[PDB]
Amino acid sequence: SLQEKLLSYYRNRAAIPAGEQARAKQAAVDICAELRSFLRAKLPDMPLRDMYLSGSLYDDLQVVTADHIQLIVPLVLEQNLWSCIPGEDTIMNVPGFFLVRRENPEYFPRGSSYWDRCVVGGYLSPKTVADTFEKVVAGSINWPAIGSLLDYVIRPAPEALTLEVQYEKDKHLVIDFLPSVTLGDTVLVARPHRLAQYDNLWRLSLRPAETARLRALDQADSGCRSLCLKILKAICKSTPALGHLTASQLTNVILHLAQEEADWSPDMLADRFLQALRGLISYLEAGVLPSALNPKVNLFAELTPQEIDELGYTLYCSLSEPEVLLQT
Amino acid sequence: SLQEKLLSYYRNRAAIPAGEQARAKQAAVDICAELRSFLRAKLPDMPLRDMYLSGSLYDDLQVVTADHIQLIVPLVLEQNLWSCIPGEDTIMNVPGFFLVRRENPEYFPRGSSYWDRCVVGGYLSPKTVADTFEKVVAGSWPAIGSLLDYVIRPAPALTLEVQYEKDKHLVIDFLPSVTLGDTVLVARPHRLQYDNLWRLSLRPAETARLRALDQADSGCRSLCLKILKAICKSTPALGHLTASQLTNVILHLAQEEADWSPDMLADRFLQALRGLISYLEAGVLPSALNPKVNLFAELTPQEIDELGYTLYCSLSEPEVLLQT
Ligand SMILES: Nc1ncnc2c1ncn2[C@@H]1O[C@H](COP(=O)(O)OP(=O)(O)O)[C@@H](O)[C@H]1O
Ligand SMILES: Nc1ncnc2c1ncn2[C@@H]1O[C@H](COP(=O)(O)OP(=O)(O)O)[C@@H](O)[C@H]1O
């Protein structure tokens, strides 16, 4: 049966071996803790708060192998000196991103905020904020040295700025930094749009609300929504042609399906999984996967029409190839 | 035998029991973490860095019972809008304390800094800072308490009384802090009244030095300190002395004596009493890190009298101080 096959798959492929999981988490926590001590007394005029961990590995949603996690770098934008403008209301015309503008320059002149140094054309540029972070914060740190204080080999990549942390003989955790600001209840991260011309836009952070929703639905049920997600994530991670699919896209297929099916008991796993499959296919066919949290946002918007067709073509072929889809 | 009484007094009175000290510290660390979450969600617009723990309980220097710790509240000041003026350069003439002045008010008007809201008469007032923090950072306690299964009671100055055990409680107080350039200041008012003055923070360097010295030696400097703290905590006539005064007595003695091996404790302990008496007779205990600061400038004449008397007498019967 498909039910057995899926549970077998989760167990032999999707589920991260516990030792691996524990050691990767420990290295992240230990590095985050050491950075907290180190940075606390270092950049006294910078509105910088403690870095903190975020991502599927932190949430028990990472699959196959523990290989990555984020350190969010929370920055403070002072009261009433800043506003965010939704992307769809800018000429850039992209929902799910925001411009951040310096407000009241005419009364609290350029110079008033620490972040004025990262202001360009009146806007707080996420790439200039990220450059400042890398040069001023990350740069003040000897990475291989901290790994030596802790007992890890830490290698900063020369390529986007990430840390490769060997936590096991032949296993490494890749850590990347996400500068973040919050305006009202709008949480923004500097993860650039795929294309350069959009590099002035901060990205709206969806993950915390997405994963909260998913968890809250399963707690109430108590359903197999997260198990289904982890399985689909493992298939995509394990299939190169499915490389363009993200955890957010898969999570939102499941959240939409949650509006249509209330019953996610353990024995419904197979039916829901197949539903999630045909559903993902139909969104690809439509070229649009609306965010379950903010339906103005199209989660496929950074993919090209050709990429979207290739994904759908791949999934259709997979239906007749359960053995490759469910390796190993 | 003095040696014996000191060693036994450390274990019998000064050393906090292990369960108590771990639970109390862990409670502080747990509340500190939740605070981070509240600031993240509820105060994204206040230029405050994350609060962090500070004090003897965090340093394994607390004695007798785990009953208090501080959370530093680190304000972020623009380097171009603020300066600190050293107390000795003021008519008030108070070394070890600073004024924090708002600079360039005509070019950058009120509002150019979040912290302008805590300015009075052109200076950043620790009072309004504490008020603001208490008013604004008071949208957050029983949820943090239920979460950690601690009962948490905020005082109606704002401090937290945390029941971490049936018959024990930890009192957490908040210490506003600003750092300008290389200078770290805390809102801990002069004990004897210039309450516009911030205090130069000496504790981190003081304790780091004491630790460094013992670490190199496996010496008994910290042991001697904790015994002295316990005695003062236990002896009303001696309660006027602070951990910092006692720590600095020890730092100065460490400059004079190289041997702090375990059996030197009794001798170093007596030297510390006699040191106290000599600084008392001078009315001056300079900070070992910043000798222009007189740590005894915060003691009253009546306190200096009682301390001196109590200590002179004790020198003939040191063990009287080692009451069970
Ligand atoms: N707080 C956050 N806000 C926005 N994006 C985040 C946050 N934390 C992690 N991410 C992003 O989430 C993505 C990783 O998704 P994740 O849920 O970890 O699934 P996966 O296990 O497939 O990596 C990355 O693009 C990363 O930048
Ligand atoms: N970072 C700091 N800078 C300056 N003073 C501090 C700091 N942290 C704590 N203090 C002060 O230290 C005093 C407590 O001293 P501590 O070393 O904890 O000894 P004790 O155990 O006797 O309380 C309090 O007045 C508190 O405000």
XYZ file of C-alpha atoms and ligand atoms in Angstrom:
706
model
C 0.000 0.000 0.000
C 0.923 3.660 -0.439
C 0.454 4.207 3.290
C 3.195 1.684 4.145
C 5.436 2.949 1.354
C 5.170 6.535 2.650
C 5.899 5.659 6.285
C 8.773 3.481 5.139
C 9.988 6.424 3.019
C 9.746 8.898 5.860
C 11.656 6.537 8.113
C 14.484 5.603 5.724
C 14.929 8.909 3.879
C 12.959 11.907 5.149
C 13.631 11.571 8.904
C 17.037 12.932 9.987
C 19.073 10.480 12.078
C 18.726 11.615 15.684
C 22.436 11.832 16.475
C 23.024 13.958 13.400
C 20.063 16.161 14.319
C 21.219 16.662 17.911
C 24.793 17.468 16.964
C 23.811 19.988 14.276
C 21.342 21.740 16.575
C 23.973 21.819 19.371
C 26.527 23.505 17.100
C 24.021 26.142 16.018
C 22.972 26.891 19.578
C 26.580 27.001 20.775
C 27.641 29.350 17.984
C 24.596 31.586 18.548
C 25.347 31.700 22.289
C 29.016 32.644 21.728
C 28.071 35.358 19.231
C 25.656 36.791 21.782
C 28.426 37.140 24.379
C 30.911 38.394 21.844
C 28.785 41.030 20.099
C 27.035 42.369 23.225
C 29.859 44.785 24.056
C 31.152 45.542 20.539
C 29.111 47.916 18.366
C 27.742 50.269 21.015
C 26.033 52.744 18.651
C 24.502 50.046 16.425
C 20.801 49.253 17.010
C 21.546 45.541 16.929
C 19.822 42.825 18.937
C 20.941 39.273 19.665
C 21.179 36.994 16.645
C 18.756 34.090 16.868
C 18.215 30.781 15.087
C 15.457 30.223 12.545
C 14.631 27.581 9.966
C 13.362 24.062 9.466
C 16.217 22.526 11.449
C 15.208 24.656 14.420
C 11.523 23.679 13.919
C 12.072 19.914 13.390
C 10.973 20.279 9.762
C 14.364 19.677 8.123
C 14.590 16.473 6.136
C 17.101 13.854 5.018
C 20.144 15.498 6.607
C 20.809 18.398 8.968
C 22.793 20.741 6.716
C 21.522 24.322 7.131
C 19.917 26.883 9.425
C 19.652 30.674 9.597
C 20.916 33.206 12.079
C 18.462 36.096 11.953
C 20.184 39.413 12.610
C 17.541 41.631 14.200
C 18.018 45.378 13.718
C 16.040 48.239 15.233
C 14.407 50.890 13.060
C 13.580 53.785 15.413
C 9.999 54.850 16.068
C 8.613 57.229 13.431
C 11.779 57.542 11.337
C 10.760 54.809 8.893
C 7.859 53.363 6.908
C 7.442 50.367 4.643
C 5.633 50.545 1.309
C 4.115 47.356 -0.131
C 5.840 46.272 -3.334
C 2.593 46.162 -5.267
C 2.242 49.887 -4.552
C 5.709 50.644 -5.996
C 6.710 50.760 -9.662
C 8.521 47.473 -8.981
C 5.023 45.964 -8.717
C 5.845 42.857 -6.643
C 3.657 41.716 -3.739
C 5.514 40.057 -0.868
C 8.277 42.645 -0.836
C 8.465 46.141 0.632
C 10.377 49.332 0.109
C 11.566 50.865 3.390
C 11.644 54.676 3.291
C 13.329 57.186 5.618
C 10.572 59.403 7.031
C 10.802 62.928 8.432
C 14.259 63.695 6.942
C 13.111 67.292 6.825
C 12.912 67.450 10.620
C 15.292 64.763 11.855
C 17.937 65.327 9.192
C 20.177 62.726 7.567
C 22.577 61.900 10.374
C 19.864 61.297 12.988
C 19.715 57.527 12.643
C 22.513 54.981 12.644
C 20.921 53.501 9.514
C 21.188 56.745 7.562
C 24.574 55.382 6.516
C 22.659 52.634 4.629
C 20.088 54.947 3.082
C 20.154 55.279 -0.727
C 17.829 57.599 -2.665
C 15.713 57.953 0.478
C 15.221 54.220 0.939
C 16.792 51.752 3.353
C 18.487 49.358 0.952
C 18.551 45.739 2.080
C 21.721 45.115 0.096
C 23.450 48.077 1.691
C 22.241 46.892 5.115
C 23.561 43.422 4.331
C 26.892 44.817 3.118
C 27.143 46.818 6.364
C 26.332 43.720 8.426
C 28.977 41.650 6.637
C 31.699 44.305 6.794
C 30.994 45.719 10.263
C 29.511 42.828 12.245
C 30.466 39.531 10.604
C 33.814 41.077 9.659
C 34.764 41.818 13.265
C 34.744 38.075 13.958
C 37.419 35.401 13.501
C 35.291 32.443 12.481
C 37.863 29.623 12.584
C 38.860 30.998 16.020
C 35.367 30.749 17.561
C 35.154 27.211 16.204
C 38.342 26.633 18.179
C 36.866 28.040 21.409
C 33.903 25.777 20.831
C 35.245 22.480 19.527
C 34.291 22.864 15.848
C 36.033 23.466 12.532
C 34.295 26.571 11.165
C 34.949 27.658 7.580
C 33.537 30.947 6.254
C 32.857 30.674 2.520
C 34.886 33.074 0.318
C 30.247 32.996 -3.111
C 27.621 34.155 -0.612
C 28.642 34.665 3.028
C 27.862 31.416 4.873
C 29.542 29.430 7.620
C 30.372 25.759 7.061
C 30.432 24.085 10.474
C 31.777 20.523 10.710
C 29.806 19.008 13.562
C 30.521 15.425 12.645
C 33.330 13.500 10.951
C 31.809 14.076 7.503
C 28.764 16.241 8.213
C 28.601 20.035 8.077
C 25.944 22.623 8.938
C 25.712 25.653 6.627
C 24.702 28.837 8.461
C 23.612 32.011 6.602
C 22.662 35.388 8.095
C 19.376 37.202 7.499
C 19.324 40.826 8.562
C 15.795 41.662 9.663
C 13.737 44.719 10.564
C 10.187 45.049 11.851
C 7.783 47.890 11.214
C 4.551 47.543 13.155
C 3.707 43.849 12.697
C 5.385 43.679 9.282
C 8.528 41.524 9.551
C 11.048 41.966 6.756
C 14.225 40.071 5.876
C 17.066 40.938 3.500
C 16.801 37.919 1.258
C 17.155 39.513 -2.179
C 14.655 39.045 -4.978
C 16.085 36.657 -7.580
C 16.645 39.521 -10.076
C 19.070 42.436 -9.657
C 16.696 45.240 -10.699
C 14.530 44.355 -7.685
C 17.465 44.529 -5.256
C 15.979 47.555 -3.419
C 13.105 45.475 -2.004
C 13.019 43.819 1.415
C 11.249 40.432 1.454
C 8.176 39.930 3.643
C 8.890 37.198 6.204
C 6.229 34.469 6.006
C 7.885 31.430 7.560
C 7.013 31.978 11.230
C 3.287 32.465 10.453
C 3.278 29.572 7.937
C 4.834 27.084 10.360
C 2.707 28.325 13.257
C -0.406 27.699 11.190
C 0.752 24.228 10.159
C 1.595 23.299 13.738
C -1.612 24.769 15.141
C -3.750 22.779 12.685
C -1.987 19.503 13.559
C -2.191 20.147 17.325
C -5.943 20.651 17.106
C -6.679 17.682 14.832
C -4.401 15.899 15.591
C -3.405 15.501 11.963
C -0.567 14.352 9.757
C -0.023 17.665 8.005
C 3.619 18.053 9.101
C 4.412 14.428 8.252
C 3.019 14.942 4.779
C 5.108 18.119 4.371
C 8.331 16.464 5.499
C 7.767 13.667 3.005
C 7.176 16.054 0.105
C 10.197 18.112 1.164
C 12.345 14.963 1.144
C 11.171 14.008 -2.348
C 11.978 17.477 -3.690
C 15.344 17.667 -1.929
C 16.187 14.228 -3.329
C 15.140 14.994 -6.881
C 17.329 17.469 -8.846
C 14.597 18.401 -11.318
C 12.460 19.303 -8.286
C 15.217 21.619 -7.014
C 13.220 24.781 -7.693
C 10.384 23.871 -5.276
C 10.637 25.427 -1.782
C 9.411 24.445 1.677
C 7.150 27.517 1.678
C 5.486 26.465 -1.587
C 4.922 22.921 -0.268
C 3.659 24.213 3.087
C 1.119 26.425 1.337
C -0.236 23.591 -0.837
C -0.944 21.791 2.447
C -2.480 24.871 4.082
C -4.869 25.373 1.136
C -5.782 21.683 1.221
C -6.511 22.174 4.924
C -9.422 24.431 3.929
C -10.842 21.624 1.782
C -10.206 18.605 4.020
C -10.775 18.725 7.759
C -9.813 15.094 8.372
C -6.051 14.448 8.597
C -5.980 11.410 10.874
C -2.977 9.029 10.619
C -4.687 6.615 8.172
C -5.530 9.471 5.792
C -1.838 10.119 5.131
C -1.791 8.463 1.684
C -4.954 10.155 0.379
C -3.809 13.584 1.582
C -0.331 13.012 0.149
C -1.768 12.220 -3.277
C -4.046 15.252 -2.896
C -1.038 17.435 -2.136
C 0.679 16.033 -5.245
C -2.201 16.658 -7.672
C -2.733 20.037 -5.980
C 0.865 21.175 -6.421
C 0.477 20.082 -10.039
C -2.669 22.154 -10.546
C -1.104 25.277 -9.025
C 1.879 24.843 -11.384
C -0.585 24.430 -14.233
C -2.188 27.717 -13.145
C 1.229 29.366 -12.817
C 0.070 30.802 -9.503
C 0.325 29.531 -5.941
C -1.230 32.105 -3.639
C 0.129 32.360 -0.121
C -2.418 30.913 2.329
C -1.422 33.723 4.672
C -1.443 36.581 2.195
C -3.284 35.666 -1.017
C -1.916 38.799 -2.743
C 1.459 37.031 -2.751
C 2.182 34.528 -5.545
C 4.734 32.046 -4.178
C 5.753 31.129 -7.758
C 6.485 34.791 -8.716
C 10.278 34.361 -8.812
C 10.026 31.336 -11.106
C 9.956 31.754 -14.868
C 7.038 30.297 -16.900
C 9.518 27.792 -18.329
C 10.644 26.666 -14.885
C 7.012 26.258 -13.847
C 6.238 24.070 -16.857
C 9.324 21.941 -16.229
C 8.310 21.338 -12.618
C 4.790 20.319 -13.631
C 6.187 18.108 -16.377
C 8.502 16.451 -13.884
C 5.731 15.726 -11.371
C 3.453 14.322 -14.056
C 6.172 11.934 -15.178
C 6.784 10.941 -11.560
C 3.278 9.526 -11.174
C 4.332 6.537 -13.273
C 7.685 6.258 -11.460
C 6.829 5.703 -7.768
C 10.142 3.813 -7.362
C 12.341 6.805 -8.229
C 10.106 9.256 -6.373
C 10.375 7.090 -3.248
C 14.083 6.220 -3.338
C 15.778 5.420 -1.163
C 42.294 26.386 62.948
C 41.451 29.879 61.815
C 42.201 28.206 58.511
C 39.824 25.389 59.443
C 37.067 27.712 60.566
C 37.320 29.719 57.328
C 37.253 26.678 55.056
C 34.351 25.155 56.992
C 32.516 28.485 57.126
C 32.709 28.735 53.337
C 31.034 25.349 52.916
C 28.645 25.689 55.842
C 27.400 29.242 55.190
C 28.738 31.126 52.144
C 28.448 28.502 49.434
C 24.878 28.418 48.111
C 23.493 24.877 47.888
C 23.878 23.510 44.362
C 20.202 22.942 43.568
C 19.209 26.394 44.763
C 21.971 28.166 42.824
C 21.272 26.280 39.594
C 17.495 26.800 39.769
C 17.875 30.472 40.614
C 20.396 31.103 37.856
C 18.375 29.011 35.396
C 15.270 31.008 36.288
C 17.091 34.261 35.490
C 18.397 32.837 32.194
C 14.911 31.626 31.284
C 13.255 34.977 32.021
C 16.025 36.756 30.115
C 15.287 34.629 27.018
C 11.523 35.264 27.131
C 12.260 38.986 27.463
C 14.149 38.743 24.184
C 10.955 37.356 22.586
C 8.791 40.163 23.923
C 11.200 42.869 22.717
C 11.342 41.180 19.307
C 7.568 41.042 18.886
C 6.415 44.128 20.806
C 9.228 46.722 20.721
C 10.840 46.541 17.254
C 11.004 50.363 17.223
C 12.836 51.054 20.508
C 16.645 51.355 20.105
C 17.416 49.044 22.982
C 19.768 46.111 22.577
C 18.743 42.809 24.136
C 18.788 42.792 27.923
C 21.348 40.483 29.552
C 22.183 39.171 33.026
C 24.809 40.668 35.309
C 25.783 40.222 38.950
C 27.313 37.777 41.412
C 24.691 35.091 40.802
C 25.735 34.969 37.138
C 29.425 34.852 38.154
C 29.145 32.164 40.865
C 30.091 34.904 43.351
C 26.741 35.127 45.166
C 26.773 33.913 48.793
C 24.487 32.384 51.470
C 21.344 32.244 49.330
C 20.519 32.865 45.679
C 18.281 35.904 46.024
C 19.120 38.555 43.416
C 20.459 39.395 39.957
C 20.383 42.320 37.508
C 19.173 42.605 33.925
C 21.152 45.259 32.087
C 18.946 47.414 29.835
C 21.279 48.643 27.112
C 20.139 51.833 25.416
C 21.660 52.586 22.036
C 22.855 56.206 21.679
C 23.905 57.816 18.399
C 27.624 58.629 18.628
C 27.004 61.982 16.875
C 24.142 63.102 19.187
C 25.537 62.323 22.646
C 28.662 62.713 24.763
C 29.585 61.820 28.299
C 31.131 64.386 30.604
C 33.324 62.960 33.395
C 32.103 63.908 36.890
C 35.451 65.411 37.855
C 35.015 67.961 35.056
C 31.734 69.139 36.578
C 31.380 71.604 39.455
C 29.773 68.684 41.280
C 33.259 67.120 41.142
C 32.277 63.424 41.323
C 34.854 61.052 39.783
C 33.451 57.706 38.577
C 30.198 59.310 37.485
C 29.291 60.997 34.208
C 26.769 63.345 32.694
C 25.319 62.216 29.377
C 24.741 65.386 27.341
C 22.600 65.780 24.216
C 24.871 67.296 21.610
C 24.072 69.416 18.564
C 20.488 70.263 19.607
C 20.180 73.148 17.120
C 20.953 70.975 14.073
C 19.306 67.768 15.356
C 16.127 68.877 17.198
C 14.261 66.817 19.825
C 12.992 63.681 18.108
C 16.284 63.035 16.256
C 16.936 60.381 18.863
C 14.399 58.013 20.385
C 16.067 58.850 23.694
C 15.262 62.550 23.440
C 12.078 61.524 25.234
C 14.219 60.893 28.322
C 16.131 64.183 28.167
C 15.632 66.857 30.809
C 17.544 70.128 30.677
C 19.810 68.949 27.870
C 20.935 65.774 29.671
C 19.759 62.173 29.511
C 18.103 61.583 32.863
C 18.493 58.115 34.421
C 15.176 58.863 36.197
C 13.085 59.398 33.090
C 14.972 56.541 31.443
C 13.890 54.250 34.286
C 10.332 55.649 34.088
C 10.075 55.194 30.319
C 11.408 51.641 30.599
C 8.949 50.865 33.374
C 5.991 52.414 31.471
C 6.799 51.240 27.942
C 8.532 47.963 28.713
C 5.435 47.188 30.783
C 3.235 45.734 28.070
C 4.821 42.338 28.665
C 4.767 38.680 33.570
C 2.371 35.903 34.655
C 2.532 34.407 31.165
C 6.307 34.286 31.467
C 5.767 32.837 34.948
C 3.203 30.222 33.959
C 5.427 29.401 30.987
C 8.419 28.660 33.248
C 6.244 27.384 36.132
C 7.559 30.234 38.289
C 5.286 32.644 40.149
C 6.487 36.116 39.090
C 5.451 39.224 41.044
C 6.520 42.650 39.708
C 6.773 45.407 42.342
C 3.976 48.031 42.084
C 10.925 50.667 41.584
C 9.907 47.915 39.169
C 11.588 44.697 40.269
C 10.546 41.084 39.765
C 10.107 38.676 42.664
C 10.489 35.186 41.210
C 9.402 32.190 43.271
C 11.757 29.524 41.926
C 11.410 27.267 44.988
C 8.889 26.710 47.775
C 10.664 28.935 50.302
C 13.094 30.966 48.199
C 12.766 33.829 45.767
C 14.999 35.656 43.324
C 14.701 39.422 42.990
C 15.546 40.691 39.522
C 16.199 44.425 39.126
C 16.689 46.367 35.879
C 19.795 48.509 35.342
C 19.606 50.937 32.435
C 22.954 51.207 30.613
C 24.456 53.408 27.867
C 27.793 53.009 26.118
C 29.452 55.972 24.450
C 32.717 55.163 22.717
C 34.790 53.201 25.197
C 32.727 54.195 28.235
C 30.072 51.925 29.744
C 27.626 53.693 32.084
C 24.824 52.335 34.304
C 21.940 54.074 36.046
C 22.963 53.279 39.615
C 22.664 56.654 41.428
C 25.337 58.007 43.766
C 24.368 56.749 47.237
C 25.266 60.000 49.005
C 22.402 63.504 45.651
C 23.446 64.072 42.043
C 20.803 61.870 40.433
C 21.534 63.267 36.983
C 24.857 61.420 37.102
C 25.431 57.989 35.526
C 27.875 55.581 37.187
C 30.930 54.285 35.379
C 30.417 50.489 35.239
C 33.392 48.843 36.975
C 31.935 45.455 37.765
C 32.772 43.561 34.552
C 36.448 44.570 34.588
C 36.730 44.073 38.358
C 35.374 40.545 38.216
C 37.197 39.654 35.020
C 40.480 40.583 36.692
C 39.743 38.625 39.853
C 38.894 35.612 37.692
C 42.015 35.939 35.537
C 44.248 36.044 38.621
C 42.701 32.943 40.234
C 42.577 31.063 36.936
C 46.357 31.387 36.481
C 47.011 30.274 40.087
C 44.098 28.110 41.105
C 44.293 30.735 43.857
C 41.946 31.535 46.753
C 41.208 35.173 45.880
C 37.534 34.499 45.007
C 37.204 32.146 47.956
C 38.466 34.901 50.261
C 36.060 37.353 48.620
C 33.011 35.090 49.065
C 33.831 34.457 52.715
C 34.060 38.221 53.316
C 30.794 38.825 51.471
C 29.023 36.192 53.559
C 30.295 37.725 56.813
C 29.090 41.172 55.803
C 25.775 39.708 54.657
C 25.501 37.975 58.054
C 26.800 40.744 60.322
C 24.696 43.934 60.615
C 27.649 46.039 61.817
C 29.518 45.025 58.660
C 26.624 45.093 56.172
C 27.569 48.577 54.946
C 30.445 47.156 52.909
C 29.677 46.299 49.252
C 30.887 43.429 47.073
C 32.844 45.999 45.033
C 34.590 47.487 48.053
C 35.550 43.983 49.204
C 36.625 42.928 45.693
C 38.874 45.978 45.432
C 40.436 45.297 48.828
C 41.351 41.867 47.413
C 42.628 43.241 44.084
C 44.973 45.589 45.942
C 46.144 42.723 48.195
C 46.749 40.624 45.066
C 49.148 43.344 43.870
C 51.041 42.988 47.174
C 50.969 39.165 47.563
C 51.839 36.560 44.897
C 51.092 33.419 46.900
C 47.383 32.576 47.061
C 47.753 28.799 47.462
C 45.050 27.075 49.554
C 46.783 27.272 52.963
C 47.463 31.013 52.583
C 43.714 31.758 53.002
C 43.839 32.540 56.745
C 46.732 34.983 56.321
C 45.155 36.685 53.313
C 41.856 36.905 55.170
C 43.512 38.716 58.105
C 45.392 40.963 55.684
C 42.043 41.888 54.111
C 40.572 42.899 57.492
C 43.609 45.065 58.250
C 43.464 46.508 54.747
C 39.840 47.469 55.298
C 40.784 49.212 58.546
C 43.556 51.219 56.869
C 41.383 52.391 53.978
C 38.716 53.184 56.591
C 41.101 55.371 58.610
C 42.026 57.172 55.411
C 38.396 57.414 54.342
C 39.550 56.334 50.893
C 39.443 52.997 49.078
C 40.611 53.666 45.550
C 39.249 51.512 42.741
C 42.074 49.207 41.675
C 41.125 49.805 38.042
C 40.456 53.546 38.333
C 42.233 54.953 41.406
C 40.641 58.440 41.140
C 37.376 56.805 42.140
C 37.067 56.577 45.931
C 34.759 53.643 46.640
C 34.301 54.873 50.199
C 32.930 58.224 48.994
C 29.555 56.520 49.258
C 29.817 55.623 52.954
C 28.591 57.890 55.743
C 30.951 58.895 58.584
C 28.771 56.846 60.935
C 29.178 53.764 58.726
C 32.942 54.315 58.547
C 33.048 54.543 62.355
C 31.077 51.329 62.934
C 33.024 49.401 60.299
C 36.358 50.473 61.797
C 35.302 49.670 65.351
C 33.754 46.297 64.449
C 36.901 45.360 62.497
C 39.489 46.421 65.112
C 37.744 44.306 67.743
C 37.381 41.280 65.450
C 41.159 41.175 64.810
C 41.606 39.762 68.329
C 38.875 37.142 67.815
C 38.488 36.677 64.017
C 36.420 33.535 64.513
C 33.591 35.581 66.062
C 32.857 36.580 62.446
C 32.605 32.912 61.473
C 29.418 32.247 63.436
C 28.181 28.780 62.428
N 12.221 34.217 9.960
C 12.294 34.019 8.625
N 11.685 34.846 7.754
C 11.742 34.659 6.414
N 12.423 33.658 5.842
C 13.079 32.765 6.616
C 13.055 32.885 8.070
N 13.785 31.862 8.560
C 14.235 31.138 7.497
N 13.813 31.701 6.344
C 14.008 31.255 4.947
O 13.390 29.976 4.818
C 13.980 29.291 3.711
C 14.298 27.872 4.139
O 13.051 27.231 4.342
P 12.864 26.168 5.522
O 11.496 26.352 6.143
O 14.113 26.131 6.368
O 12.776 24.835 4.621
P 14.023 23.949 4.120
O 14.114 22.850 5.168
O 13.549 23.473 2.757
O 15.213 24.863 4.093
C 15.212 30.083 3.302
O 14.935 30.771 2.070
C 15.427 31.070 4.436
O 15.957 32.313 3.969
N 27.280 45.544 34.709
C 27.287 46.252 35.865
N 27.891 47.453 35.986
C 27.882 48.135 37.155
N 27.280 47.695 38.276
C 26.647 46.497 38.272
C 26.619 45.701 37.051
N 25.932 44.572 37.325
C 25.546 44.637 38.632
N 25.984 45.789 39.184
C 25.799 46.259 40.569
O 26.546 45.441 41.473
C 25.903 45.475 42.763
C 25.806 44.037 43.241
O 27.136 43.534 43.313
P 27.497 41.981 43.131
O 28.882 41.879 42.524
O 26.316 41.261 42.537
O 27.594 41.647 44.709
P 26.428 41.095 45.686
O 26.447 39.591 45.511
O 26.957 41.538 47.041
O 25.133 41.757 45.295
C 24.564 46.169 42.568
O 24.668 47.504 43.060
C 24.366 46.180 41.061
O 23.607 47.300 40.598
